[PDB]
Design a protein around this nucleic acid. Structure first.
Lengths: 50, 113, 215, 121, 121
RNA sequence: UUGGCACCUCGAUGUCGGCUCAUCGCAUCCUGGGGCUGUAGUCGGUCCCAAGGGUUGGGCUGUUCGCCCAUUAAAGCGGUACGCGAGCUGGGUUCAGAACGUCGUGAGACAGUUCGGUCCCUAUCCGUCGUGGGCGUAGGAAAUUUGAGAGGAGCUGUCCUUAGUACGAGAGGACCGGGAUGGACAUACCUCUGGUGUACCAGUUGUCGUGCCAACGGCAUAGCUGGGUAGCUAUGUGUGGACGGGAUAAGUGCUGAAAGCAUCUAAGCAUGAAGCCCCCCUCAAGAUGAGAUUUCCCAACUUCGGUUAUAAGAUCCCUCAAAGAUGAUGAGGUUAAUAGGUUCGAGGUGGAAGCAUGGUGACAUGUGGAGCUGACGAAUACUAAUCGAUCGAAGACUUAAU
């Protein structure tokens, strides 16, 4: 099938309400002092506790 | 092997039957009550399979009668088998003797110990 | 006018008095207590609440459903009992014969009782119309191009629309099902186990509701 | 099976044999998260075989290992079945299970695949 | 008997040798018959000398099946071929002999005459 | 239905039969309830009410139509663009080839017949089936629920007693009641019987490799063959359409005048169908008319007349399955048995390697019901669920009474 009518900019932007990405999900490393992903090793000094 | 199932069906198991393997001649005394009196019929044949289980174990026996093959399958713990004798022990190489269905006459004879 | 809660364990078989074979289901029903009594003067209808399986106590940093939370402890403190994770009501019983905080035993059911069983069916996922609704295939040869598409729900052209309640693919299973007119085979006092002749809806370790037959 | 890893039956078994062998040689490798959770069972059941030491245990482990040669030490060469039965199994005689540890790294460029580190405890 | 085109052997003393199922009696839409059922059939092979000839549409009853039957005590019996016996209208065999073992479920006050002649029940 | 007319469509509204058995009407084929009979009974004929459910498989023909065979309680008639080709086919009919009969001087046509002959499209909007997020329901939360409504199911045969009784010269042969067992359909489930079971066990052929023997590995459809765990399954195993109320349809009445008689009707009172409303099963408070019950949390700063984070609680992120396209749902996160590993089992296969004895040898016997084993039952913190972060209340106004 082919579209019957042109899609307006109002309808197009409504459809993109939920099209987006999320936050990485990061925590602070208490050896590096810098940010890292949860349950992943630090990348500054390469340490993983626990 | 659940704890509850094996604890309820414990009173159905019968510690009165002999030990047999697939491929031996065996006689089963069956209590038939077909009619107006209770008599005993005897079925004699060769054991061809025993698929395992607990109280739901089964076995199958095969015999030849007037040119027609017959299969009988009983539950091992049913209260309708009086007793069981082991006439002779055979020599087989597997657990399921399904190849006996296509063999008739001389080729269908199993060796002995 | 009696009911319990339990967990389905599996299927087995037992022998009858005449030597016949019947299939049975092993059901484990323990730790049943009475938690509340709703009356017409207060709630507008008579019923009793029953809890089935006891949880763990309160915890400061609990993360799962293993430990009871604060609101559930107050409800299980009115009647002296540990918090329960399965709570169901029974409208078929007479309230004045029951008292809040007493155990419900499998002895309430005797052998030969006629019961109905309620449970939740097993889930199958997203299924096609052949399996979900039990309709037929199209030809598999003779130049055919119609094998497993929906083939019994066609529509006309006058209405210019599709009617409601059509039978096309979707999610199947997971529904509330009742099986009526089952029979109690044997009750077990040491293991709190009941044997029900037949089969009941649901998977292993699923909750089942047992009542008396209404008809 | 357990998880098909996007391979046929013959390819899956050949790839688990290569990953398991290379882990004995270097004792620390980097791979994919999904692959690492299936290598666990393969390597750990090979260490159980090397802790028995019987001839039948040796011949049952030669059906999974590959014929590599390890000239890593400055002394005489040895294969990967001599190292499994000689050195690695020597230091695991006390602990029962859990000879493998997995550490997460993160997504990799161009694919987004989660990278992990797998090593012997 | 299982279908509308199943060919049956005949195990009595008459000219008929093989038959072909034409219909399964006992209800609208029924399409399977088992031991103890009556069917409408036709004769495809016969012997020279007998009351039954080729091309005759007759009634028969079922005595042996490869699919067998289940008792209400958990036992099964399964034969090695499919066989039938031609009968008169009043449940009576039109032959004088019966060959082969016969299923034990044919005695319920309905087919006593056939059971009497059977060499083995 | 065959026709009449020529109002939309020729910058295109795809034409017969079949697959499908969806949806509707009643002028009812079966079942349910009745009046009359040239209704003795068992069957019938004709008319009235009734649309709840049901209303087979084959041979011939491209066929619709029709004839026939074997059954059935019955094998109903019609509409839906002669229902349905962006769902399927392409047998027939109106493309290009070739042949027969007939017509024509001819190129060629059929009042006709025969063999062969490309079926395109990734779904924007409405509609239909499943499944999530936001806000609202005048504090914030966890559970349990009422049912305004809506949707399912609704079929029927054969035997045995009453009774060889009533009826009938006789042959024949019951209404009204009480039981047993089926056919078709629906739903749940894997204990039994089978199917499958590409990381389970065993046998065997060719050819490469592990330096050789022995023992194993790759390729040849999973090389082929015999079995088979969990899970998914029917042809397998259980269950249901039961018993009952209320008002009615056609009919049958009681008591009664208009109309001193008569009359079911004008007032008044009864009875009466598989049909209507309940009674059985499922969904259901976005039912904005947003319902009910039991529990839990509730303080500092202003004068901001209002904020604040925190409390109860729930997630981010990790180990998973009884759930699953994703997401949701459910079992867990060290104060821990959620998954992997280790140790015991169940079930499956069928007698491992090495060694000894016997044979010239292919092989056989013992150590030993051996060895091996995916999903199933237990125990065990040896590995991984670390440390952490985010959201989430302080309860508006009017009236009445205590």
């Amino acid at each position: 099938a082919v579209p019957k009518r042109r899609t307006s900019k109002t309808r197009k932007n409504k459809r993109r309400t939920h099209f987006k990405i999320s936050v990485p999900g990061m925590t602070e490393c208490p050896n590096c002092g810098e940010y890292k992903l949860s349950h992943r090793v630090c990348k500054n000094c390469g340490s993983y506790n626990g | 092997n659940h704890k509850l199932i094996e604890a309820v069906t414990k009173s159905q198991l019968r510690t009165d039957l002999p030990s047999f393997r697939p491929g031996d001649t065996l006689r089963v005394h069956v209590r038939i009550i077909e009619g107006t009196r209770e008599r005993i019929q005897v079925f004699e044949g060769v054991v061809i399979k025993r698929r395992g289980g607990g109280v739901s174990e089964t076995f199958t026996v095969r015999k030849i009668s007037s040119g027609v093959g017959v299969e009988r399958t009983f539950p091992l713990h049913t209260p309708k088998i009086e007793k069981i004798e082991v006439k002779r022990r055979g020599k087989v190489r597997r657990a399921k003797l399904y190849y006996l269905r296509s063999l008739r006459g001389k080729a269908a004879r199993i060796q002995e110990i | 006018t009696k009911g319990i809660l339990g967990r389905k364990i599996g299927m087995t078989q037992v022998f009858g008095e005449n030597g016949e074979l019947i299939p049975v289901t092993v059901v484990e029903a323990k730790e049943n207590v009475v938690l509340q009594k709703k009356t017409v003067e207060v709630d507008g209808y008579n019923a009793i609440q029953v809890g089935f399986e006891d949880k763990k106590a309160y915890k400061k940093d609990a993360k799962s459903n293993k430990y009871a939370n604060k609101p559930a402890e107050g409800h299980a403190k009115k009647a002296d009992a540990a918090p329960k994770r399965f709570i169901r009501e029974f409208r078929n019983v007479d309230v004045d014969a029951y008292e809040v905080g007493q155990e419900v035993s499998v002895d309430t059911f005797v052998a030969g009782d006629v019961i109905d069983v309620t449970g939740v069916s097993k889930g199958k996922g997203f299924q096609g119309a052949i399996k979900r609704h039990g309709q037929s295939r199209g030809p598999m040869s003779h130049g055919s191009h119609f094998h497993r598409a929906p083939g019994s729900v066609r529509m006309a052209s006058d209405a210019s629309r599709v009617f409601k309640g059509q039978k096309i693919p979707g999610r199947m299973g997971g529904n509330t099902v009742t099986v009526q007119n089952l029979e109690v085979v044997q009750v077990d006092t040491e293991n709190k186990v009941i044997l029900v002749k037949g089969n009941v809806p649901g998977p292993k370790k699923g909750l089942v509701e047992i009542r008396t037959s209404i008809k | 099976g357990y998880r098909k890893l996007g391979r046929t039956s013959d390819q899956r078994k050949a790839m688990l044999r290569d990953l398991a062998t290379s882990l004995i040689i270097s004792e620390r490798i980097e791979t994919t998260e999904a692959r690492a959770k299936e290598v666990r069972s393969v390597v750990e059941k090979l260490i159980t075989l090397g802790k028995k030491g019987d001839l039948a245990s040796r011949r049952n482990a030669a059906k999974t290992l590959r014929n590599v040669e390890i000239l890593n030490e400055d002394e005489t060469t040895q294969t990967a079945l001599q190292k499994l039965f000689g050195e690695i199994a020597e230091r695991y005689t006390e602990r029962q299970g859990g000879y493998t540890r997995i550490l997460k790294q993160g997504p990799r460029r161009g694919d987004g695949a989660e990278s992990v580190i797998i090593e012997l405890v | 008997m299982i279908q509308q085109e199943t060919r049956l052997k005949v195990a009595d003393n008459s000219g008929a040798r093989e038959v072909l199922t034409i219909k399964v009696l006992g209800g609208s839409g029924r399409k399977t018959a088992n031991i103890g059922d009556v069917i409408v059939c036709t004769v495809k092979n016969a012997t020279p000398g007998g009351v039954v000839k080729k091309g005759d549409v007759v009634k028969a009853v079922i005595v042996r099946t490869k699919s067998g039957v289940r008792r209400n005590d958990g036992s099964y019996i399964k034969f090695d071929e499919n066989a039938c016996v031609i009968i008169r209208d009043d449940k009576g065999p039109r032959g004088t002999r019966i060959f082969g073992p016969v299923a034990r479920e044919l005695r319920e006050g309905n087919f006593m005459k056939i059971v009497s002649l059977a060499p083995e029940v």
